[PDB]
Structures are given as C-alpha cells and as structure tokens.
Amino acid sequence: MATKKVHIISHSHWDREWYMAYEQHHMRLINLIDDLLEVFQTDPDFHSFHLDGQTIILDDYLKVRPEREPEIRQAIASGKLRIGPFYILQDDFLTSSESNVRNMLIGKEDCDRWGASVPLGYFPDTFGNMGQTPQLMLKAGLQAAAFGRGIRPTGFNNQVDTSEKYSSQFSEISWQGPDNSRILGLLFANWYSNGNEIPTTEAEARLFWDKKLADAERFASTKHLLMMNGCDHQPVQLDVTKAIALANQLYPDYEFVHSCFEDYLADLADDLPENLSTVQGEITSQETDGWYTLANTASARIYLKQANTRVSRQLENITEPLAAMAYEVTSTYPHDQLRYAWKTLMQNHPHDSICGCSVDSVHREMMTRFEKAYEVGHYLAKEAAKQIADAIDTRDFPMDSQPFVLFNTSGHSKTSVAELSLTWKKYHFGQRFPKEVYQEAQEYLARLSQSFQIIDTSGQVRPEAEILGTSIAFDYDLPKRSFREPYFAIKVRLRLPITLPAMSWKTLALKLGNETVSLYDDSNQCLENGFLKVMIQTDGRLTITDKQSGLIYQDLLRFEDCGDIGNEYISRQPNHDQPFYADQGTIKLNIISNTAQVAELEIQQTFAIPISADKLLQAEMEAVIDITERQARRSQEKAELTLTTLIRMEKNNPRLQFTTRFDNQMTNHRLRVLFPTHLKTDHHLADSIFETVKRPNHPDATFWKNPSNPQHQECFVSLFDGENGVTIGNYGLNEYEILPDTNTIAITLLRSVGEMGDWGYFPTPEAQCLGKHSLSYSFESITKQTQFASYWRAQEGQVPVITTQTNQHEGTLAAEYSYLTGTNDQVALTAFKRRLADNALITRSYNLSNDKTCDFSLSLPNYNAKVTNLLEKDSKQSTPSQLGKAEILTLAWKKQ
Amino acid sequence: TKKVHIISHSHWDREWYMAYEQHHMRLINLIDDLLEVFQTDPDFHSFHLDGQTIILDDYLKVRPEREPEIRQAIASGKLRIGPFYILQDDFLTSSESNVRNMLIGKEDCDRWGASVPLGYFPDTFGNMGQTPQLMLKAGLQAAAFGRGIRPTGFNNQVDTSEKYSSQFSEISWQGPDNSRILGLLFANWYSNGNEIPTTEAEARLFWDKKLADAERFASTKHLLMMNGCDHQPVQLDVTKAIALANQLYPDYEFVHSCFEDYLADLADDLPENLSTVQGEITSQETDGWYTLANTASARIYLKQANTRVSRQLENITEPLAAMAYEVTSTYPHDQLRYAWKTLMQNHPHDSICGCSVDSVHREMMTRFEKAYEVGHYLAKEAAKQIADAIDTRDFPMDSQPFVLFNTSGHSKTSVAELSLTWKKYHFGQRFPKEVYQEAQEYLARLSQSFQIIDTSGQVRPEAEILGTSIAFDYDLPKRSFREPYFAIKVRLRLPITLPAMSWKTLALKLGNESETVSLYDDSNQCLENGFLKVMIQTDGRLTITDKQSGLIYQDLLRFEDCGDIGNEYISRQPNHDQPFYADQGTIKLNIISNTAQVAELEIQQTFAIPISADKLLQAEMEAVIDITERQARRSQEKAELTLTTLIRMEKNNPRLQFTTRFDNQMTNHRLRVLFPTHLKTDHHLADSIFETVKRPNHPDATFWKNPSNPQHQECFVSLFDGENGVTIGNYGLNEYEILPDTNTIAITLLRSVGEMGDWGYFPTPEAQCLGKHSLSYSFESITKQTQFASYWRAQEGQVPVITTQTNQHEGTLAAEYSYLTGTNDQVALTAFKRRLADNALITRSYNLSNDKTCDFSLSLPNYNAKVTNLLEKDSKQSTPSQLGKAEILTLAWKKQ
Ligand SMILES: O[C@H]1[C@H]2[C@H](O)CCCN2C[C@H]1O
Ligand SMILES: O[C@H]1[C@H]2[C@H](O)CCCN2C[C@H]1O
Ligand SMILES: [Zn+2]
Ligand SMILES: [Zn+2]
C-alpha cells in the first residue's frame, strides 16, 4: 500500500570540543553512550545509532569507562552502534594532505579492532569539501560521501540550470573529482537535523511530518526519504520507536522505518535513476552570497595553523622517512609510537578545533596536544637518524675530524644553505665541580689558533662553508644502557651551502686547519643572485627583476592593516574602513648577514594603527548582531606597530624567503602581505589536498555579495599566464586572497577578533592573538620550465636538512647514499613510511597538475613495488609508468 | 654470614628536565627491555617499578596490545608494582590528595593482581609528620625514603640530642597519633647499587666500597643494594654481575631480591634497638640550603590552580554528588576516577613543585583545566539533581526559587555574591536583535524593586541588589537541543549563615521598595565590625585592634620585594640585598563598596623595583655555579610596580579577606606580604597533611647556615601565645616564613627565577611568572576560645556557597535540610564522598590538635556508621566517641 519509504537514522553530531571546554562536551558524551547502551537493553526495537562517522568517540568513552568495552563491542557486533569509517571529522583544507589520508588509515584500523565500519565518507558540516574527495573515498574503499554544505538543491518540479555549477536537482548527486573518480554524493538537503526530535503525540506529529515529508520529497531522486534523527550534541531520542509507530499509524502511504546509512545506501543501489546531476571538483560555496562560507576560519588563530604545519611536517617528512630508512638497519620501526603521535595530532583535527572557531580554553588545549605530538615525533626522528649514522662506514674521515651526516628527507633535490650547530668536543662533569670543567673549556677556546673547516670523504675542503662562531654550551647525553651524562660542549656554529639528492644522506666532517661578490649591494640597497635582482625601495617595498625572463615587478611586499569587526568564522572590515600601509611609516634597513652565499636583510617599518575597535563592537557582539549589520569602527586612538621582515636570499636558490616578526598589541584587525603581479590571467592555482586546484580570480558576481573572497591553501598559491608567473609559498598561512584589479596575491599574516561567532555570544579574548608572531612565506618568479619545481620547493622548503653526529667506524651503509631515484618536477612525494602488517616501505605520490599526465618513474633501488590503496592494502593493479591528471599513487616497496 | 639484596629498579620521574613525552618514550624502552629480559634471562628475579602504578597506564597508552604480557609479568612477580599511583610531593598536595594517591594506587594494584607492601618516598623533599598513620591505615607497615635522616655509624655512640639522626639504616617512625612504622632509609641513596660491574677488577673495587657503605648502617645481616637511579635503563646483565659477586665473595650471599622478600627477612632479624624519629622529616638538622623547601613558591600559579581543582573535587563535586545519590541512586565513580587521575598526573614531585622545564608546566596547566571541568560539570549536575527534587511549592508562581548549598564541615557565615536569572527571552526562530530589544523594553518598563524571600514569603532586608543586566546564556537539556536566550540577570549580595553540609531554598521576586552605619568610615580611614577595628595607615600598612581582647597590631600587611638569584628549588637573596618596601612608595585609597554588611577597600602602592638581576647571573647559571657561591646582584635599572590589595570585611565574619593583584614584569625577585605579631612564643602552628604541626620559630642554631627558613603550609599558619594569637589563611600560597626577632608571618606571593636548577643548566624563562597575578589570603585575630574555628574557617573559606536555580514543583526533599550534625571546632572534615563497592557514604575527619583529644559526635541523620581504613575497607572496630590526638577517622555510612 505504501509508495514511500521513510528512513529514520538516529545520530548525534558530536563536535569533540567547541563552545565549551572538551571535558564539558566529553562528560555529555558519556551520558549519550550510557543512554544508548541502556536503550539497547530496554527497547529491542531500537535499530541502530550512527556515531557521526568518527571512531574517536569510542576511545573517548573508554577513557572514562574502560570496563564497558565488552558492552560496546557487543553493541557494535549486533549493529546497534554504527561506527567510522573516520577517526575524526576534519576540516579538509586546514589539515595536511597526508592528514586526510591518515584520518582514514587510523579510522579503518579502529574499525578493524571493533569489527565493523559504515561504508560512507562523512562530511556533515565541513566548511567546504576538497576537490579530491571522490578519489580519496574510492581509494579508501568507499563508494559514497554524505555532506551538508555548498550544494543548492533545486526542485524536481523546476527546470535545471546548466550555468549554475553548484546546484543539484536531487538530494543525491554524482560527484566527480579532478582525476575522473566518481562517487555517490549524499546531500543533507534539509540539514542533518531534518528528523530531529520526532513528536510522539498526534497533533504535533501531523504538523511535523506534513512539513518534513514535503521537504524531503521535493529533492529525493527515489522513494527513499532520508530523515536524520539528531542535531549538534543532540541527546538520543529515547522514545523514537514510539514516534515511528505513531508515524506509521498516521500516514498509511509511508513506510517509516528505523534505519542506518548502510541500509539506506543499499536501497538507493536498487532504485537510483540515471539522470543524476554532476558536481565537478571542490565544493566551497562559490554560488552563494559569500558571507557564510566561513573560509576566514583559515586565518583565525594562525598560530594554531602554524603549530599544525610544524607537527605535520615533523611526522610526515622527518620522522617517518628517517624511521623508514633506519628499518634497513634495525629491522624495527616505531608503529605504536607513531600511532600514538598521529592520534594525538589528529585530536586537533576536528573542524572546530583546527578552524580556530571554538572558545579560548579549547585552543589552549590544542597547543598542549601539538607539543605532545611533536615531542614524540622529534624523539623518534633523532633516534632514526642516529641509527642510520651509526651504521655508516665513516672511516674515510681522519681521526682528527668529527663526522656528521646530513639528510634530505624530501622527495626532490634540496638546495639550501644549511644552518648548523656541531659539537666539537665534550667536557664531562664526572665527579668535579662544574665551574672547574667550564674553565677548562674556556681555556681550550683561548689556546685555539686554528680555523674550523668542513671536509668530504675524499679529504677535500668545502671552501664555501662559513664558520660563524664557537661557544660553550651545557648539554647532556642519555645513553640506552646507562646513566645521564652531563657535559659542557664546544659548539661550532656554521652555515653550509649544499645540494642533497632526494631522500639522501651525505657524510662530512668537521676539523681544524689553516685559514667572491656579496649578494647584497649596500650602496644600491640591492639583493642579487643568478635568478633575481631585488631592489629595496625607499618606502620598503620591493622591485624584483627576474634575471632570466626579464620581467620587472614593482611595489611587492606591501603590508596592509585593516579593521576586523567579525568573529572566528568570518572577517568583516568596518564601514568606510581605510587600510593602513606600513610603507607609509618610518623605514629602517639592517643587514643581518651578507656573503657570496647568503644575505639576510631586515626591513623594519613603524606605523601607527588603531589600538582596537571602538566601544560599540562590544554592544554589538553581546546582542548577537549579524556581522553584516555592525556599525562599529576602528578606534580613534592609535599605537605604533613595528614590523620587521627578514629577507633571506641564497646563491643557488630561486626562492626568496621572508620572515615577518612583530608584537601584536592591537585588537580587531587584520594584517596581510601583498604581492601585486599584474599578470594577465583570469584564474590562479592553489595548493589543495593532493591537487593544484584551478580557481577563478573573480568570485561569481551573480551570487557573491561579500566584498572579500578569501580562499584556503596548503603550501602555496600561484598565478601563471602561460609563459610567466609568480608562486608565493607559505608556512602555516592558509588564507590567501586574489585581488582581481591588479592580480595581487594577498597572504593573511594575522587576524585578531574577540568572539567565536555562530549561534550565540562567546567572548574569546585570546582570539586576538596578542604577543609575538613570526610568519614565514616566500616569493618565486616562474616560467613554464620552473613552474612545477616552484611548487615542490614551497612544499619541501618547509622541511629542514637534518643533521646527526657520529664517530669513525665500520658500517654496512655507504657514506653517501640516495634512497630513491627517478624524480619528476611534476610529481610530488607526500609519504615515505612503513606499513604495520609486514614493514613494506609505503610511498605516496601525486600529480601536481590537474590538466595533464606525466611520466612516473619513482624507484627505490633494492626494492620492488606493487600498487596499494590509500589504506596500504595491496591491489592486483600493476605499477604505472605514467600518472593520470590528479592521480594519487600509493606503493608498497619490498626488499628484493 | 651477610645477605646482599639486589633490588633492580628505576626512579622514573614522569616529567622533569625534558617534556613529558620525551621521558614517556624512554619509559617505553624501559618496559620493552624488561619484558624482553624476562624471556631471555629466566634468572632475572623482579624489577621494582618505582612504587607508582601510573607507569603501567602510560606504557599501555602507547602499547595497549601488550597488556597480557604485562599481566603475566605481574602475576609471576617479575614486575613489582604500586602501592601508589604517583610519587607525590607530600606538602604541596592536599591532605585528601595524599590519601587518593593510595586509594587509586590500590585500585590499580587490585586490577593488576599484585602490590608491593611498602610506602615509597624515595626522593620526596620532606616527609609529612602523619606518614606512619597514613601508611598503617592504608595497610602498610613500612615506608622507604631518602631525605632528612643522618645515619651515624654503629661504631659511634648514639646522640640523644639530635632528633633527626639514626644509628641504623632502619628506624621506627612515630607519628603524632602514636602510630609506628618501619622506616627504611636509603642511607647510601637509591643508587648505591647502580651499574654493577661484570669484570673481576672493577667488581672488587666496586663491592669493597659498597659493602662497607651498607654494613656501616645495617642493623641486620641484610644489606640493601638499590640497582638503579633516575631514569636508569634496566641493567640487562645483572644476573652475570650477581654470579661474579658470589664467586668473589664467599662470605657474602648476593641475591636478586625484591622489597617484599627484603621486608620479610627484616621482620625476622630486626633488633628492638632501633632509633625513633618523631613527626615530620624536613631536614631540620642540616645547613638548610638543600631542603628544596622553596619548591613551595616556585611557580605559585600552579599551586593556586592545584588548590582550585583540589577544592572543586574534594569539597564541591563529591559532597554534592554524595547527597544527590539519595535522589538518583547513582554516583559518578568513573568520571571522578578520571578527574582524579588527571589531577594526580600533576602530583609527581617534580611536577607540582614547579621544578621542571617550561613545557612540563604548560602541560600541567592543561591537565588542571581538564580535571577542573570534569569536576565542575559533575557539581552543577549534582546541585541541579538535588534542587529539582526539593519541594519548592511554598514560593509564589511570580517568584524565582534558588538553592544555596554549604558543602563544608562547619557552619558557613558569609555575604554570598550571586547572579540570578530572573527571566529568559529565548531566541526561538527570530533575529537575536529583536529578542534583545524585548529584554531592553522589559527593563525600561520595570518599576518595581527586586527582593529575596524565604519559604514563608518573608523578605530578607540585609540583601542588597547591586544591579540588573541582559546577558546571553543557554541551557543544555538532558533530553533535547541546546536552548539559547537573553537572560535578565539580577546581581546581588546576600548575607547568610548556612549550617554545615546543608542547603536552604530562597526566592527572587519583584515588590515595593535603612538605619545602617557603614562598615568603613571615610573620615577615620577605618574598617570596623563586631570583631576588628582596622585602621589604614597613611603608608598603606594596617593597624588592627581586636575589639574582644583589646590587642593592637601595628604595621600589618607590609609588601617586601627582594632579589632572587636562585632556581626553582632554592631561593637566594643576593649579597647585601636591601629589600624594597611598598609602604615607602606612593599610596592610594579607593572605596569599591561600603555598606552595613560588606566593605571592600583597595590599597594601591606604586614603588620602584629592579627590573631584573644583573648580567653576572646569566654567566653563573650557564657555568652551573652553586647558588651559595653566586655573586650576582639586582640590577641598577628599576621599573614601577603597582600592587592593588582589595580588603573585604563582612559584618558577621571575624576573618578579614585580602586579594593582592599586580602585573609582574620584573625577573629574579620575590614578593612577600608580612604580618608582624610581636607575640611571646617560641613555636608556631602550620597546616600540614592531616595535622596542625608544631614547629619552632627558630631554625636549629646547631646546624642551620641558611639565613632563611622557608616552610610548607596548606590552608593556614598561626601564632598563639596561649591566650591570644593570629591565624593567617591562604589560597595556594604554600610557602611561609616566621621571622623570629619579631614573630612576623611572611607569606610568599611571587617568586620569579630563570632556571630549573639541580644537575645542569636548564633555562626556564616562564618560571619568571610574567603577567597578571591575584593572590588571596586572610587575617584573623584569635583567642583560646576561637583558635580552632580560625583553622576550619581558613580551610572552608576556600570553598564558595554553591547556587542553583529551579522552578516551582513538588519533590521528595525538604526546602531546608542539614545532611550532618555534631560539628566540633577541633574536628576538621576533609572527605564527604561515596564508595565504589556499594555507594556507602564515606566521611573523613581529623583532630586539628596534636596535643589534645576531643569529643567526636559527627552524625548523619538516617544513616549508621562503621569505621573503615583510609582505603574505605570496613574494619571490626566500633565508632569512637572521642578523637585521639592527631587521629584521622574514616567512616562509612549506610541508609537505615
Ligand atoms: O561544528 C559546529 C558549527 C560550526 O562551528 C559552524 C557551522 C555550524 N556547525 C554546527 C556545529 O556542529
Ligand atoms: O626528581 C629528580 C631530582 C629532584 O627534582 C631534586 C633532587 C633529587 N633529584 C632526583 C631526581 O629523580
Ligand atoms: Zn560540526
Ligand atoms: Zn625524583
């Protein structure tokens, strides 16, 4: 008799931490799971509960109630708890590429431990969805994803629009990625609360269902209607069975059933039509007014994004590759510790956490977690490096010298001027008064008449090296098999120009021995190497001439300070807000260093800016006035802000490095650095999750009302006209904007606000980011031939050369070694790790281009590869010789 | 003829000179090595795991799949665990904390299936006088410890004059209640047997000394060789070393042993000839430089935080949940265990002492916040659960009921500071601005005055309405979605006396709108109530007259700033250091409030102090110069420091409250507040662990070389001449000193230093405690008749009145109820909780006097008591009617 099937999926959308401290949310999670296990006993008809796609919920429950593991396990075995397949619900754009994979890796592992998994990608609330979601789902064994933002459902009764890229006829779509992967897209057309708090009395039930059924039927491509029975931190509906029974009694034409996503997916498999509308690539709310995309979360609490970048690089690009190589020597690899580090890092990856859009105490807690994960990574990295160095045959170095090993742990050649600190001698305390040992060390340094030099395996001096100084520093060793050993160390501080092949080490040595145009021209205020001529203008901005293309760019590196009367989600400049520019202040130049190899120049600007917003903003936040209606302005009172930017140019390096430093003592404002390119193109390229995504330089004027168009980036953003362009790299600076009049790249360096935003008034004075800041970003001028290299440089430039010391000894390893070969500028390396099951060396690479294929020729000598999925499960598929556009390739290498 | 017990161990400081995770990873290596050596060397007897069960939790957080292996190793005796959870600082943790360490430790040990029957205090900086009672009433007949007892040979005659010298390495330790335990002194430190050699020449050199070192103090033929040290790796070849020792010494029987076997052998052979040590062991008979007592003022913010969480759990969360159980039949055991483990992760000595590096203490702050929020959530729940079940129908429907709780063990008299929600204007589906405008209109229209009423509808005239406002707030219902609203808030102060562990229900209502002499006289500059006349001098110091005894104290409340060129363990005032005094600067008075019930007055002093230490300090720290040799001095450059002290006097309160506020921007200094008493007495009384310990006002002139004598306190310190005295209360201000020439009580408010100290140079810039501070402390003038009341006042004053609102409803509970009776001034209440096994209500009380017995009449209506030990296990013993001197009594109450 019934022609519709109404699926009721009981769920709770459980943001780990948000408007309250984690523990406040945590204790309410205990109540939820408690109510669930109790209801599973009292009401046998209660079908299942969907645990928000995140396995961390189970961990968080057991941390309080570990003795309830068997009851949890049984509930999962019978299907009453529906778990996974992710560990946390991330922000896509603000976590690293690898982090998006490791969320699935760890989630799957947790699911395997429990014995079940929901086969649905879960992005119910994500502030924009990465373009690579289809490939990431498929290659993690998932055929569908559910999401809530950025697609406007148009009626079935209205004719479709082909001009509108981000509209869909039905609540079900076909999502295609840049690599041509396709998945089922499941859109919460009526939000994930459409079936929240179903009534149990007739009159209320009728009013509820008359609306809800019509709202669902309007968008559904099939007879299966999706009713989501929950909301944010919603307690479980304990009388849902009775509510379903009433619904069935009132609407004989509708089959109301307590359901789960797996069953809903299976019913859609039978009845889904062939005319589903297609969505292409990233979904970032392009076709909206642009005021509620929440993209400004990218610049909320930038210090968080910086910490996240620090730890992500540490785990992905230092610790894992080092431990991956050390395995060849130790036959062991720290899986448990790495899992502990990744879990700790990813507790910062739920969207309200990483987005910086929670309360003050939440973000203070994240900082602790960042520190904890980093320390673990850092311990493991130092261990791996010593293990490798200890196995190197270092006997080409005379007894008078102190060997040390440098590592490039990135996937392309690394050319830099390495900044090093080496221990030359150790003066052990033993049983003596430390002051007397200190005096010995001082006396040694005073007797010293020789100069330090660096030598290679063939006894040749590296004349390019520069010794900066010697000093005495307390230090200590912590042996594996005995007590701590304190000592005063003679330390030699030096810089070393070096080019290290991809995934390589080279051993050199420090010794005593006997013992070119500077990059900066002092009379001309000019930095110049083989690639660039950088003139420092009297106002402090830069005129950069590319010495190979010939193109001149004036007025680069402009600092802009604007009011911000918004919140942690959304930036708003006040009415008739005029920018303050640092170049209009007082400018001082300072040479930090200047040689033929490296020059470091400081540009200091002092300019007065408003100290805060005026007294009106406080009244406007307290009353929860929408940010678009606010009449508050910047205060009339001003204070001097001093910006120092250190410019590092290196001799053989096309990438120009900047570090901008200041003490922020001002509230409700935003600081950006600007690079006007004036390049002739209507699009730009941005570093996204496993892709260089093409975006228009103008937002869509049909829909867009926000004067601003902030966008997300990982390591770089770029403009290219077909022959020439500019790549701006960053480190934890995830918000950029393109200013279309001039094609200016604007990088957000600081955003200070005083409140969370969203549903209420939640004061967050710490969101003002008072205190010292230091932001790193770079400029590179590009041609067709260097475009891709500029991309990997911005990526791998985030990772320092690693250094470790060891003595003269026999070893099984060569002094100079490349772990891999066959690198392509167009192929990025993001993972170099080992697999838990059998210790296979897992690599992951992706095509830096969305347009065209390239040759793939990655090779690890002594190893054979086979293709795996993102979760490191072998597939039958054979190793490709080429990457498809936007292909992500994961490989397991086994020692031959 | 001699038996040498080799106990392998590692002294594992959870976090110290490195970040926790750095130590954590090395712990994984320790346990890995142990499990491995259990498999490869069958002769390896056991390993003593530093007396702390947290080690096992920490290991399993990284390697959870190794739980079976751990359990097997524990079952066979190869791992010796517990009996504590952590190794605390005795003095710097709460009284209850010292019990809970054993409670949780026991629970952990019971779960694992074995326990070492030895209290473990290997490195504690001072041992609490109540150690024997605490050990016996926890099922322990012995404690091991390392500090504060000087062993004199059996060759030298035993000196009766020296309280803290022992003839042997074994003592009888006698508590203030006459409890005796076996004291096991590490006479040669817990490293005496570290790194035993495996070669003949080294072994003989080693054992000739070590055996003679032990034989010199051993009362029996049993020699204690502790095979380990701080963070010592396990000695993998110890079996070999023990076999070599046996081949070399036919006269000696070297065995790989454990503490249990060692104690069992001791019980046989111990002579009745052992020295007795009485009370606390704090290194009273040393030079006084290496007591490490100044750990009490290292990073005072930590101690404040610890106090906040300690009061939250002990005196708010548990007392409310214990009562709420009557209604819900449930009590949050798991949540509380989680709260306590989190809190106690901050209780290892190097943690709470603030003698670690900066990152360790940043992590502690997160842990404090986490523990606090769990407790705070549970308290608000319990209060709500109770209030929701009170019969509140006696109040009119146009009124707003609220319940006030006193959760302390005595009568609480204060002026409660309250903020009540009068009306809720819910957001519903409207724009917040419209709803806000409604709330503003209500207040604009409002013509009546707010009043407080009791059950009989009678107005409380002493209540003062301070003001009304609009504030965003929200409710989080148990069974539905969040509910935002704008609340009309009434801010008011309410004088009230609540009996011990009781509640009272009042109500807020509107109604129609004397004869009051204000507490402060603006002409006299005088604060005056029934108890004290407080004259503020022109220099800002205080002249307080006790209106009862007639005694006058001049020049009270002096602020003294001194140099500190020491470290986190030890304070050192530079050579010829001349203190700067706030009264010698610029003084300002500001009235904050002044009524018949309450007066709040602010004394502001602005004075110039040195901004730092001179440049020589840096050199001295770097070279690791001992603090007693440092020639560093305060800098010549000074800055202005502004202290604001808020004095609060209440009409019926004899205790005068102070809150000193300032922004610390100067380094290497100490700030104290002094109370000169000039009382004729040679001893003082300090709040210690379950005791009011008697201490001399003078350090021991025979031994003491340190110009200072800093001591530890919990909630108060007091001077009494036999008829009159002074009690100074504090909140997290755990360091005090008595200045003997004037009998001045000095409370340390700030101690700022730049390094950790101990075995090397570890810079700790955050130990300078830069930023905003707020320190709370109290003054009471006492007589014989009010002495003990001042102690529980200072204890219970740390705990606020709890407030919770509820609507008009029927209910099982009375509107006004006392949960206990039979309170006595001499009897403190420290625990009011429930017991896991059967939800029996657990009370703990102690005698506030070490001298005299007192009547004990504690009674819980509807309940019957039986005596338990500290760990809540029933004994056959019957409920005493008197408390013995310094007795701690734990009771379990069941409903009748
Ligand atoms: O994550 C929370 C919130 C985001 O912070 C902003 C948009 C709405 N979301 C609902 C909550 O789950
Ligand atoms: O706790 C460490 C340290 C203390 O912090 C101070 C002196 C004794 N040391 C032993 C170590 O374990
Ligand atoms: Zn969310
Ligand atoms: Zn220690």
Numbering used by the authors:
A (entry chain A): 1 to 515, 521 to 901
B (entry chain B): 3 to 515, 519 to 901
What do the authors of the reporting publication say about this deposited model?
Streptococcus pyogenes M1 GAS SF370 ORF Spy1604 encodes a putative GH38 α-mannosidase. We have shown that The S. pyogenes ORF spy1604 encodes an α−1,3 mannosidase that is active on disaccharides, some aryl glycosides and can also effectively deglycosylate human N-glycans in vitro. This, coupled to the presence of a gene encoding an N-acetyl glucosaminidase (Spy1600) on the operon (an enzyme known to break β−linked N-acetylglucosaminides) would suggest a role, in vivo, in the utilization of human glycan-derived carbohydrates as a nutrient source. Comparison of SpGH38 with Drosophila Golgi α−mannosidase II suggests a conserved domain architecture and catalytic centre in which diversification in the “leaving group” subsites accounts for the subtly different specificity.
Here we report, what we believe to be, the first structure of a bacterial α−mannosidase from the human pathogen S. pyogenes bound to the therapeutically important inhibitor swainsonine. The natural product swainsonine is known to be a versatile glycosidase inhibitor having previously been used to study the active center of the Drosophila enzyme. In addition to the favorable electrostatic interactions discussed previously, the position of F127 is conserved across α-mannosidase II active centers. Additionally, swainsonine is stabilized through stacking interactions of W18 with the five-membered ring, suggesting that the two aromatic residues contribute to positioning mannose into the correct orientation in the −1 subsite. Other conserved active centre residues, D125 and D232 are in equivalent positions to the catalytic nucleophile and general acid/base, respectively, of dGMII. As with the Drosophila enzyme, it is likely that R149 will encourage D125 to be ionized (as required for a nucleophile). The hydrogen-bond from Y192 to D125 may also stabilize the ionized form of D125. D232 will likely be neutral due to negative charge repulsion from D125, as expected for the acid/base. The structure of SpGH38 is consistent with previous proposals (notably) concerning the chemical basis for catalysis with net retention of anomeric configuration in this family.
